[PDB]
Each structure stands twice: as structure tokens, then as C-alpha cells.
């Protein structure tokens, strides 16, 4: 299995997306803030940051996460109407399609090595 942390203020969107990831066998931790101290302590394989960003400036957060953990160690994804590329691995514009969402996560994850299985 694996651990993924989701940061957002909207409970409704979170319930739909968490179910998709959990079904795949991944555990999801929902946060309504996005503090680096807590994120670092609960350092997951990947983080999902959804707008509006409670933590504030995503670039600083990404820089801090990247500085502590390499992109290979920790993947960063952003959710919103427009993909704000601030060092994130991939953007997932709304509405998020469940059919391609899982595929995108898998594709991003398999970038680490060709021998996924």
C-alpha cells in the first residue's frame, strides 16, 4: 500500500477523490491547512494540494518539500481549475475525471522505474 496526503478546504470534493484513491489500495490523509511541519512529519509518497490553498504560497511549500525530500521521494500534485505549475509533477484540472485520474497517478508513480511490476 501507500500513503497520500490531501490538502483542501472542500469536504465534498475530498470525499469523492479519497474514495477513488482508497479503492486503489492507497491510504489518504485529509488536511484543511497544509502546514509543512505536519506535512513533513506525516511525509507521504505524494501530496495533493487543492485550491484554494490554505497554506498560502504553494511555491514556498513546494520549495520546502523539495528541499527536504527529492521529487523522486515525494510527488506533488495540484488540484484546481488551472494547473499552477510551481514545481509540481502533474496538474489535475476540474472537473477531475475518475477514469483518467487513477491513470495519471499510476503514470506519474511509474516514472520512478520501468519495472513497476
UniProtKB/Swiss-Prot annotation:
The domain of life for this entry's organism is Bacteria
Q: What is the effect of changing residue 38 to D?
A: Loss of KaiB binding
Per the record, which residues fall in region PsR domain, binds KaiB?
A: 1-117
Provide the effect of residue 18 to R. Answer: Loss of KaiB binding
From the record, what ranges are coiled-coil?
none
Q: Know anything about its domains from the record?
A: The N-terminal domain is followed by a GAF (phytochrome-like) domain that lacks the conserved Cys residue for ligand binding, a histidine kinase domain and a C-terminal response regulator domain without the conserved Asp residue that is phosphorylated (pseudo-receiver domain, PsR).
What does the protein in this record do? Functions in an input pathway to the Kai circadian clock. Senses oxidized quinones via its C-terminal pseudo-receiver domain, providing a link between cell metabolism and the clock. Affects the ratio of phosphorylated to unphosphorylated KaiC, binds quinones via its pseudo-receptor domain. Quinone-binding destabilizes the protein rapidly. Autophosphorylates, does not transfer the phosphate to its pseudo-receiver (PsR) domain. May play a role in cell division.
| Subunit relationships | Homodimer. Part of the circadian clock (KaiA, KaiB, KaiC, CikA, RpaA, SasA), the composition of which varies during the circadian cycle. KaiA and CikA compete for binding to KaiB(fs). The PsR domain binds the KaiB:KaiC CI complex but poorly to either protein alone. KaiA and CikA bind to the same region of the KaiB(fs) form and therefore compete.
Q: Which family does it belong to?
A: In the N-terminal section; belongs to the phytochrome family.
> What's the protein called, per UniProt?
Circadian input-output histidine kinase CikA
Instruction: Give the organism the record lists.
Output: Thermosynechococcus vestitus (strain NIES-2133 / IAM M-273 / BP-1)
Included range, full protein = 613 to 729 of 729
